[PDB]
Amino acid sequence: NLLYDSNGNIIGFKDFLTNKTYTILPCYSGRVSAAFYQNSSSPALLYRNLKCSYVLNNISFISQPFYFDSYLGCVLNAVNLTSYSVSSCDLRMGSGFCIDYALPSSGSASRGISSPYRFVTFEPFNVSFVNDSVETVGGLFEIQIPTNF
Amino acid sequence: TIAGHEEFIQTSSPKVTIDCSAFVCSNYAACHDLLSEYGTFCDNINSILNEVNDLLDITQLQVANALMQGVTLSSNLNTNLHSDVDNIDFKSLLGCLGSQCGSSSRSLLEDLLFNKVKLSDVGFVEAYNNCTGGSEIRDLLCVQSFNGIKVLPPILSETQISGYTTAATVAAMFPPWSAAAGVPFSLNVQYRINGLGVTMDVLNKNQKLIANAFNKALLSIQNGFTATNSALAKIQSVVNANAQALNSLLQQLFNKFGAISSSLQEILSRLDPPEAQVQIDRLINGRLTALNAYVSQQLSDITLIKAGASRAIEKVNECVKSQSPRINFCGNGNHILSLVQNAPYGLLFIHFSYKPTSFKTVLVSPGLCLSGDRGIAPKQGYFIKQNDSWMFTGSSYYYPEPISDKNVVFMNSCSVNFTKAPFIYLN
Amino acid sequence: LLQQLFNKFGAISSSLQEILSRLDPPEAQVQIDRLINGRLTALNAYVSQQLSDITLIKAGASRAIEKVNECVKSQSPRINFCGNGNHILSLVQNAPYGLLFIHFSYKPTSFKTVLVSPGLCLSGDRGIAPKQGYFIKQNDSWMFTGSSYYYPEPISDKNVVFMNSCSVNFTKAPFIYLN
Amino acid sequence: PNTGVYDLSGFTVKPVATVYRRIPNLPDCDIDNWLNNVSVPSPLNWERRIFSNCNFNLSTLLRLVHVDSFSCNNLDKSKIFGSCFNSITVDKFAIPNRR
Amino acid sequence: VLNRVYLNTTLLFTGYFPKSGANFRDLALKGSKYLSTLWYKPPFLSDFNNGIFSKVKNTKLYVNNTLYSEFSTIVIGSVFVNTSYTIVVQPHNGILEITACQYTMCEYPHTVCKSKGSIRNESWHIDSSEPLCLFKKNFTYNVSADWLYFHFYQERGVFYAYYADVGMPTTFLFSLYLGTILSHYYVMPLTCKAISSNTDNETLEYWVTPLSRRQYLLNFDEHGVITNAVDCSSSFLSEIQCKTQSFA
Ligand SMILES: *[C@@H]1O[C@H](CO)[C@@H](O[C@@H]2O[C@H](CO)[C@@H](O)[C@H](O)[C@H]2NC(C)=O)[C@H](O)[C@H]1NC(C)=O
Ligand SMILES: *[C@@H]1O[C@H](CO)[C@@H](O[C@@H]2O[C@H](CO)[C@@H](O)[C@H](O)[C@H]2NC(C)=O)[C@H](O)[C@H]1NC(C)=O
Ligand SMILES: *[C@@H]1O[C@H](CO)[C@@H](O[C@@H]2O[C@H](CO)[C@@H](O)[C@H](O)[C@H]2NC(C)=O)[C@H](O)[C@H]1NC(C)=O
Ligand SMILES: *[C@@H]1O[C@H](CO)[C@@H](O[C@@H]2O[C@H](CO)[C@@H](O)[C@H](O)[C@H]2NC(C)=O)[C@H](O)[C@H]1NC(C)=O
Ligand SMILES: *[C@@H]1O[C@H](CO)[C@@H](O)[C@H](O)[C@H]1NC(C)=O
Ligand SMILES: *[C@@H]1O[C@H](CO)[C@@H](O)[C@H](O)[C@H]1NC(C)=O
Ligand SMILES: *[C@@H]1O[C@H](CO)[C@@H](O)[C@H](O)[C@H]1NC(C)=O
Ligand SMILES: *[C@@H]1O[C@H](CO)[C@@H](O)[C@H](O)[C@H]1NC(C)=O
Ligand SMILES: *[C@@H]1O[C@H](CO)[C@@H](O)[C@H](O)[C@H]1NC(C)=O
Ligand SMILES: *[C@@H]1O[C@H](CO)[C@@H](O)[C@H](O)[C@H]1NC(C)=O
Ligand SMILES: *[C@@H]1O[C@H](CO)[C@@H](O)[C@H](O)[C@H]1NC(C)=O
Ligand SMILES: *[C@@H]1O[C@H](CO)[C@@H](O)[C@H](O)[C@H]1NC(C)=O
Ligand SMILES: *[C@@H]1O[C@H](CO)[C@@H](O)[C@H](O)[C@H]1NC(C)=O
Ligand SMILES: *[C@@H]1O[C@H](CO)[C@@H](O)[C@H](O)[C@H]1NC(C)=O
Ligand SMILES: *[C@@H]1O[C@H](CO)[C@@H](O)[C@H](O)[C@H]1NC(C)=O
Ligand SMILES: *[C@@H]1O[C@H](CO)[C@@H](O)[C@H](O)[C@H]1NC(C)=O
């Protein structure tokens, strides 16, 4: 009537009353990541590898107006701005993503109620670019030579 | 002909993070109350692992800085159009670059390497996404992460590292030539071959054989990751070592350490609070000991990984982006050049080299004493006697040529075991 | 490390003064043993951390000895070892727990667009290659320029390397017999 | 506190309900009828009964026999109350006075 | 194992097992008329220390194209008198009758094949008074089976019995508290008329090996059947197999 594994746990059973067979799985367990910038009233929160549907239905029932889904997991209390790129980051969330902080200023105080945390792209290194060709132009190559130093 | 071989150097490893009180005392409140009177034991373990992961991120940015230092690309560069220079096909080496592709790909050599390795950096993320259900029933990674053991992603994704190596490989091919000494790729090949003792007439007349030997070695590199490649065994040893360490750490939650049971559920359903404490204490001590030993081992392995990363940075600087006058540094002697590709937890270098095939036995002299009691010695070659005339040949290809001042180094005197050759006042 | 003298390690107190003023010698040993084991474990962990940091220190010190020997006291023909490329020289200063290296580098400011050639095919089907620089066409005549400063100048025997053949994509120029 | 990324302590999803299963209409163990049987054995030929597939409680068992002392070992008394076991073996004998 | 199922896995399990590389011993005896007294001697009257494992042949006699199953009965005990309890396992052509009573056992006992009866009468006890019995039960086995397998052991005053008629791994039959220690067993001679080589060429077989508590590595397949086992202390290959918890 009981199904075991080699470590000694019960992983399934068959009911004495109904002759129905079931398996057992454990309940979900995990932690939260908090990206916190100094002199703020709250952190931004990341639920790693979780959907926001699961987060709002099975984890927390408290008030959270801002939430979205990212490749890293569910982000609460931050703004989805991953079209904008940043080269120096002190809240680096993993796999190329950053949390930026920008409080609304005196004159740059947008009246729409948002979060000062943004979820942006981390990209530290770059190439230099030139506006010259990649092939021969009449046999000769186009190149950029210094004239002063 | 031109030979080629590949070599994997390991620059990182999976970043393990550990929830200490979740590992020791998973959900049970009496265990947590007992663990509170051990002081700062769990905070120290967390701090050591965070220091290790900071070191891993520093070395990752150093590798990425070596790949991108001083490279200037044309903004007209579009690798859906530009994948061939001088009859050498670099199509399987480049990912995507250009303002009309969207940098969201690997090269196919990277794809062959990254599909035989299941638990890469993106494999961990997409495996942990399936842990609300197991996606069939169950998985070992979900059991580990419910017991407080997770692998964190690195701070740069692997498509960014692939973009770095793509820009490095394409800086050698195209008219700024920031990685091929400011001269084109075939010209740089001919100069590095000519610097071994091979004359430039042979290399001007055998240009297509050089290109075809390059393409042949590249295609045999690509069709070679098949179950006996040593660099693939090098790559998979990293993943198997990480999996064995984490599974043997998870097996510590089923030792009794001298208690009556290895389960807190069983002790808390059979005993009283003054009697369950003595049994819970032994499980606490054994699990904290196992965590301490794991933390010491990770601390000693990060030093090996940093030594390997510094060697890989030196190879990118002095083998891939330039070519040193050091002999037997990259490759083995008769080394021509190197390329780099992104591998799981490291880099993969391709070394091209000169390879002789057939031979001829020559009688040679190292020096000629001319009349006036002067001397000449050959400049990377030997002196030979052909048809009773003295001639020069390079040391790595048999090709006689007239003795001129570009083959010799003069001396106002001459050595005693030079051969006397008074007939010589030639060109 | 000093904070470990206030952990209890599962005993009744973290002070030996309190334990030795409340208990008998047989009963106090059980409490003292937990403190002794926890403190020795904390010391062993500190020693492991120091053993691991001295390896990174030795690797960095060997890199500093290399840079003193081959960037300050002489200059090696390696590129990208000291500095970044376009590197000129280094000086060294003493810093707390290390050395401070000052690297000087050739930094270009303004640039120019030129059309260059990588090698010429002279009559007799001989070939010349430019020595660290390019062949440019100035006033419809071939000249040499170095790669890191634009300065046209005559094609001579000190700007080239000579070949008795010429490569297939080289530029044909019969009008050169010059010095 | 300083600017940083902080990993906070662990949550578990809280259990909504209880599933509770028992077998209905099982016999009574009648441990009191054998404990209060008339013929009492000596310690030399002590007696054993096995009780399985039944229903018991310790309240009626401890108020139907006249208890001097009820100690337990490797178990706690309050852990018996909602429990199920595979069997219960009950040995009984009379106690000599000096022993 | 008792009410557990294991599925596609290896398991390290300590139990009451035989020793890999030891010997069986065919203790079956057949007679027609005479009974030698050396048939009842300590070569054949063996020891029951922790238990026995035994492999039994089901001899299939035929009368009128109708099957008859037959093998030898076993008796377990300590002194085999009517002041101590003895266990008797006796087959009755598809019915296995197992009794634990205070028997008054005969000095030279035997049984008789019932399909083609023998010269003598079946005589292993004489008791018209129906003695005290701790246990009395009837089990049914597969008549068409070739091999039957039996585990018999003791532990802390309790006697345990496992059996199989389909396949080699056994399943639990019964347990019985005794409070004493059993110390001998004996397989009885089955006296028959037509079993030998001048008749239909049949044979009695009853092979016994001792049992002890030891650790095996077991292999459970997808339906939960034991398919392979290895004794962890029989060779060097088995040590590699148990320390790696692998069969290859
Ligand atoms: C579950 O399966 C068991 C099989 O063991 C069923 O028990 C059988 O019930 C029928 C009719 O009630 C009897 O004829 C059999 O003798 C029983 N078997 C045994 C071994 O006792 C049981 O009825 C099933 N339950 C349900 C709800 O279907
Ligand atoms: C108390 O125990 C004795 C045995 O020690 C019980 O006697 C049994 O009684 C039944 C009839 O009810 C007989 O069939 C048994 O054979 C008796 N056994 C013995 C060994 O004599 C007695 O019944 C018990 N008392 C009660 C109230 O049940
Ligand atoms: C505890 O056990 C006693 C028996 O020792 C149970 O008492 C029986 O209760 C049922 C109905 O509740 C009666 O029909 C029986 O006659 C009772 N027997 C005796 C000997 O008193 C009692 O029910 C049990 N407790 C609970 C909560 O069920
Ligand atoms: C087990 O089955 C056997 C065979 O069916 C039963 O043995 C027979 O029992 C009847 C009734 O007492 C006797 O008349 C026969 O002589 C017995 N046969 C033999 C060959 O001796 C036996 O009674 C059954 N056991 C139980 C406990 O019911
Ligand atoms: C911001 O934090 C700093 C801590 O370095 C503190 O000194 C300062 O007063 C804070 N500013 C405000 C406006 O709270
Ligand atoms: C965040 O913004 C990007 C770009 O605007 C978009 O592609 C992405 O879908 C957004 N995220 C969500 C959850 O909508
Ligand atoms: C390239 O990266 C650097 C990093 O400092 C950044 O400043 C620069 O703006 C980037 N280039 C472009 C075109 O965005
Ligand atoms: C520079 O590039 C832009 C497009 O990026 C192009 O329109 C322009 O003509 C280029 N300038 C020169 C001088 O070639
Ligand atoms: C180079 O720059 C310096 C400083 O700006 C200036 O004085 C000088 O005239 C420049 N030379 C040329 C050739 O442009
Ligand atoms: C020479 O250049 C042409 C383009 O001008 C190219 O098609 C050809 O492949 C080149 N050949 C070699 C050997 O470089
Ligand atoms: C996760 O599960 C989905 C469906 O359940 C499956 O398609 C996908 O391949 C799984 N991925 C991993 C890494 O297990
Ligand atoms: C058999 O066991 C292996 C263990 O690696 C497992 O992968 C496989 O799914 C199992 N087969 C079945 C039918 O359960
Ligand atoms: C077998 O068959 C014969 C002939 O029909 C009959 O005489 C005999 O009694 C049968 N045997 C038994 C045991 O009934
Ligand atoms: C066996 O018993 C029966 C009836 O008691 C009797 O007829 C027969 O002669 C007996 N056989 C022997 C050998 O005593
Ligand atoms: C066991 O019994 C069943 C049905 O009685 C039969 O199909 C099977 O063949 C028997 N086993 C053997 C080994 O004959
Ligand atoms: C028994 O075996 C012998 C082999 O020597 C054979 O000759 C005889 O016919 C067999 N008889 C039967 C009934 O199988």
Author numbering:
A (entry chain C): 646 to 794
B (entry chain A): 795 to 1221
C (entry chain C): 1043 to 1221
D (entry chain C): 299 to 397
E (entry chain A): 51 to 298
Provide text from the study.
The spike (S) protein of HKU1 plays a crucial role in cell invasion by binding to host receptors, with the transmembrane serine protease TMPRSS2 recently identified as its protein receptor. The S protein of HKU1-B forms a trimeric structure, with each protomer featuring a furin cleavage site “RRKRR”, akin to SARS-CoV-2. S1 comprises four domains: N-terminal lectin-like domain (NTD), RBD, subdomain 1 (SD1), and subdomain 2 (SD2). S2 includes the fusion peptide (FP), the heptad repeat regions 1 (HR1), the central helix (CH), the connector domain (CD), the heptad repeat regions 2 (HR2), the transmembrane domain (TM), and the C-tail domain (CT).
